[PDB]
């Protein structure tokens, strides 16, 4: 308070703020590859589905939509990039 | 009722304020004292006074009384001061929360470690 750096703010209390109210605004959502081990290849699903993403070959499911992030259907793996 | 007035209670205070190395718990002498050290124009009032400063004297003897602070109390206190022999070195070692010990590491040095947890 009264004296501090708006230019180099802690990566932590920066981290806890709104997605618009950061220093430089940017998102907080991510992407991931997903597998239902019947398969061999993987699909890339956005963290916030809106649409219930459907697998590549087998019309199986993959995830469900919510009020934000998606619920990955049951027997699934992932990794974030 | 026999509530002493202010002029009574006032005087007696200042009386004890500077003639405790004198007086007593006895009225009759405290009475004869007043004439010597303080000037008043009334027999009635003088006794009226002494009696109470005599009472005041009687209850100081068993612990201080407010208003009167003839400084002999502040310096009887000063030497009266002391206690301890046991401190807080025993037994075991300085028990701490995780973070408190995480604190030490993240600043300090050698500390007798003894860490438990906590719950909701």
């Amino acid at each position: 308070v009264l004296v501090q750096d708006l230019l180099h703010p802690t990566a932590a209390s920066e981290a806890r703020k709104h997605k618009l109210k950061t220093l430089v605004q940017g998102p907080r959502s991510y992407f991931l590859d997903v597998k239902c081990p019947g398969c061999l290849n993987i699909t890339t699903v956005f963290s916030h589905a809106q649409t219930a993403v459907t697998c590549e070959s087998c019309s199986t499911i993959l995830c469900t939509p919510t009020g934000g992030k998606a619920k990955l259907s049951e027997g699934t793996s992932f990794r974030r990039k | 009722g026999r509530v002493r007035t202010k002029t009574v209670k006032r005087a007696s205070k200042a009386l004890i304020e500077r003639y405790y190395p004198k007086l007593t718990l006895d009225f009759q002498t405290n009475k004869r004292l007043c004439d010597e050290i303080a000037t008043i124009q009334s027999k009635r009032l003088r006794n009226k006074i002494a009696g109470y400063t005599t009472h005041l004297m009687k209850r100081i003897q068993k612990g201080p009384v407010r208003g009167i602070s003839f400084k002999l109390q502040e310096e009887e206190r000063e030497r009266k001061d002391q206690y301890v022999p046991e401190v807080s070195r025993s037994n075991g070692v300085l028990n701490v929360d995780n973070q408190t010990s995480d604190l030490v590491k993240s600043l300090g040095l050698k500390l007798p470690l003894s860490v438990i947890n906590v719950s909701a």
Binding site: L2, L6, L23, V24, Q25 | -
Partner: protein, 129 residues
Amino acid sequence: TRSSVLADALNAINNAEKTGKRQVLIRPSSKVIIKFLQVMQKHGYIGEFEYIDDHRSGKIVVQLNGRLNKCGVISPRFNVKIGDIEKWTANLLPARQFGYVILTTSAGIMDHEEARRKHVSGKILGFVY
């Protein structure tokens, strides 16, 4: 909706100072805002600032110091006819000896004293003391 970009960042600078602060974060930044914020710095009234590149209009972090009393914007950017440039300073400046009416001219953004020495006039922006 947001109406004079200058005006906001200007006021904030004031409310920072007033609140005893030493830095301000201003948004959305602009050519005008800079070239104004340039002139304050030039005469001692704030320190150094920094443009940050949001991929939008901009954010500016100002380092101010304490010398500054008031920085204000004139909100219908009136026209000043070189005779009238005296009338303005007179109206709103604390003394003859210091402080500036800053304004906008075809010959550039500048303080009336420089817009005196250059002998060009135009529209009026704001001021500093």
